[PDB]
Amino acid sequence: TAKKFKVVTTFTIIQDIAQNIAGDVAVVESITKPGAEIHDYQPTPRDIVKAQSADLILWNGMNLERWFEKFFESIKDVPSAVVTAGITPLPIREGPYSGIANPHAWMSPSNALIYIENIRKALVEHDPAHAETYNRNAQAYAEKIKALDAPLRERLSRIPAEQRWLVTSEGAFSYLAKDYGFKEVYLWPINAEQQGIPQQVRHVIDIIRENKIPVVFSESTISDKPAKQVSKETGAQYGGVLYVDSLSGEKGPVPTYISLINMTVDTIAKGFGQ
Template sequence: MPKNWWAAIALLLALGALSACAAQGPASGRPDSEDPRPLVLTTFTVLADMARTIGGGHVRVESITKIGAEIHGYEPTPSDLVNAQEADLILDNGLGLERWFERFVASVPVPHVVLSEGVEPVDIRSGDYEGKPNPHAWMSPLAAKTYVDNTVKALSRLDPAHAADFRTNGELYKRELDAVMKELKEAFRDPGAARALVTCEGAFSYLTRDAGLQEAFLWPVNSDAEGTPHQIKDAIRFVQAHKAPAVFCESTVNPSAMEQVAAATGARLVMPLYVDSLSAADGPVPTHLDLIRHDIRLIKEGLAP
C-alpha cells in the first residue's frame, strides 16, 4: 500500500479525533445514542460469527471485511481505520492470513488478540509460501476449538461481568465442533469413495488432515497470479493419477483455471466451497459451523463412487 496513502489516513484519523472531541465535549466514550456494549472488530466474517455466538449479545461484533471479500490481500479503506478507532478489541486470525493487518493494527491504538495462537500449524508444501504455516486453521473442527478458547479469554478480559456466559457459550460451541468432527469422520468412511481433494486454493489442509484425505490445489494462497500453466498441469496430473471424479473451487475466487483442469481430465467441477467468507444470512453458510458442514457435504457428494 503506498506510503502517502497511510499518511493521508493518519491525517484523517487525527482530524476525526479532533472532530469527535469537539462534538462530545469533555465527556469521553460513545454518544448516548449509540450502542453502549463493547465493540469487537474481527478481520473477516467467520471470526465475527464465532465472536458473536460466544459473546451472546453482551458485545457488539462487526467484521472489517464484508461477505464475499477476498481477505488475503484486502486493502483497508479510510473508513475502516476511522471505524476501528471506536473499537474496544480487534480479533484477527494470524498465521500470515491477513497480510494487510500488521500495518492496519499499528495505525489504531486498540488491543488485539490472535485467535489461532496455540494451534499446531500445517505447513504449506509448495510455491512461494513453502514452509510457512497454512493460515486456514478454522476449517478444522479440532483446531477451531482453540479459536473458541481464545475468544472466550479475550471477551472475558474485555467484559469480566459476563465471563461466565462467555465460558458457557464457548463450551456449547465446542460441543457443536465435536459433532461436526464426528460428521466429518463418518462422511469419508466409504472405502469405495475417492480420497483426493483438489481445490483452487490450498485452504483445506486442516480439514483433509482431520478427514484422512489427500490434498492437491492450484495455488497455496490466493494471490494475484492464480492458475499459471504450471499449476494447471500439476493439478491435471494429480487428478489423473488419483482418478479423482471431481475437482472443487471456492466462493471467493475465479474458477476459470479449475475449469481447464476439469475439461482436461473429465472430472466434474463442484462449487462453491466456502472458506474465507460466510454467505449472507439467507445463504447456504450463514455461520462458521454451517460453512464446515456445507463443505463436508459437497466434498462427500463430489468424491462419492
C-alpha cells in the same frame, strides 16, 4: 445494560464464532464483507474508523491477513488478540510462501475448539464484567462444535481411503484434509499473485489423470475459471464452490461457521457420489 461491548474481527468466520461466544452482551462485526478476498484485502479509511471504534480487535494470524499488522498500527488504544494461539500449524508446501504456516486452521473442527477458547479468554480479559456470560456461551458453543466432528468424519469416511484426493483451487483445505485423511492437490498454495498460471494447471491435470480423481472444486472468494478449465480437460467433474475464506451473507446458504463446515463437507461428499 448500557452500551454493548464492541468487537471487530478481520473476516467473517471469526465474526460468527466470536458472536456465538459474545451472545447478547457484545456485538461482533467483520472488516471484510461476505465474499471478499481476505488474504490481500486493501483496508480503507472506513475500515480504520470501524476498528478504532471497537473495544477489542480479533485476527487470525498465521500469515492470513497480509494487511493486518500495517493496518493495526493506525489504531490507538484498542486491544487485539490473535485467535490461533496453541494451534499446531501445517507449513505451506511450495511457492513463495513455502514453509510458513498455512493460515486456514479453522477448517478443522478440532482446531475450532481452540479458536473458541482463545476468543473466550480475550473477551474475558478485556470485558471482565461479562466473564460469566462469555464462559457459559463458549461452553455451549464448544459442545456444538465438538459434536459436529463425528457425523462429518463418518460421512467422509465413506470415500475409499486411496480415492481421498481433495483437488481445489487455493490450497486452503490442508487442515481438513489432515483431519479426514485426504491427499491434497491444488492450483495455487495460497491466495497471492499467481492463481491459475500454467505449470500449476498442468501439474494438477497430471495428478487427476494418473489417479482418475473424479472431482475438482473452487472456493467462494476466488475465480472458478481455473477449476472449470481443469474439469473440462480431464475426466473430473466440477464439484462446485467450497466455502473456506468467507461466509455467505446472512440471507445466503452459508450464514454461519457451522453451516460453512457442513456445506463444505457435504459438497465434497456429493462430488464423490456421497
